[PDB]
Structures are given as C-alpha cells and as structure tokens.
C-alpha cells in the first residue's frame, strides 16, 4: 500500500481536490481519513467535479457500497478500474503523489 502510486496517505480533502485538477474523468487517488482513523477516502474526478467515497471497514474487510467488500485497497482499486459498480465512473489514471 505504501508503494501504490495512487495512495497519498495523510492529505486533506482540500489537498486531494487540488491534486485532481485539471479535471480528467477517472483520475483518482486514495487518502487516509482524519475524522475516521483507519478509514480511507477514494477521490475521483468525474464531470469536472471531484467525487469522494468513504471506504468503510466491515468484518475486517473494506467497502464503499456495503454490497461488495475487499480484503485490501489494492483489490478494491483493481476492481473499480475494471467496472464502475456503485461509483460514478471507472478508475483510470492514478494521480501520483
């Protein structure tokens, strides 16, 4: 996870929105949640906006939609790069840190 190009660690929501400019559909990053210790936020550029998804923990697993769960963030990002599922658009380019 420390080696993931899309993982920006402890950056704020405002810093994440600034990182995802100029808008590019599917441009994305993952950050750590400050208000929810241990949780994450997946930030994705869509329709010139930045959409934020809280990544929750359920039974040790990770989830955005509480329908599909993953063991780790890497499997979650690989999934949402193949099909958008519950999120607005597929993950395409990782915004590098």
Swiss-Prot record:
Domain SH2: 6-95
Tissue: Expressed in various myeloid cell lines, detected in brain and lung.
Protein origin, superkingdom: Eukaryota
Locations listed in the record: Cytoplasm; Membrane
Assembly and oligomerization: Interacts with KIT.
Family in the record: Belongs to the protein kinase superfamily. Tyr protein kinase family. CSK subfamily.
Protein purpose: Could play a significant role in the signal transduction of hematopoietic cells. May regulate tyrosine kinase activity of SRC-family members in brain by specifically phosphorylating their C-terminal regulatory tyrosine residue which acts as a negative regulatory site. It may play an inhibitory role in the control of T-cell proliferation.
Protein name: Megakaryocyte-associated tyrosine-protein kinase
Species annotation: Homo sapiens
Residues of the full protein shown: 117 to 213 of 507
């Amino acid at each position: 996870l420390s080696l993931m190009p899309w993982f920006h660690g402890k950056i704020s929501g405002q810093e994440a929105v600034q990182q995802l400019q100029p808008p590019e559909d599917g441009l994305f990053l993952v950050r750590e949640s400050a208000r929810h210790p241990g949780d994450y936020v997946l930030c994705v550029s869509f329709g010139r906006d930045v959409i934020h998804y809280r990544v929750l923990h359920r039974d040790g697993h990770l989830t955005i939609d509480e329908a599909v769960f993953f063991c780790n963030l890497m499997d979650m990002v690989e999934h949402y790069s193949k099909d958008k599922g519950a999120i607005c658009t597929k993950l395409v380019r990782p915004k590098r840190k």
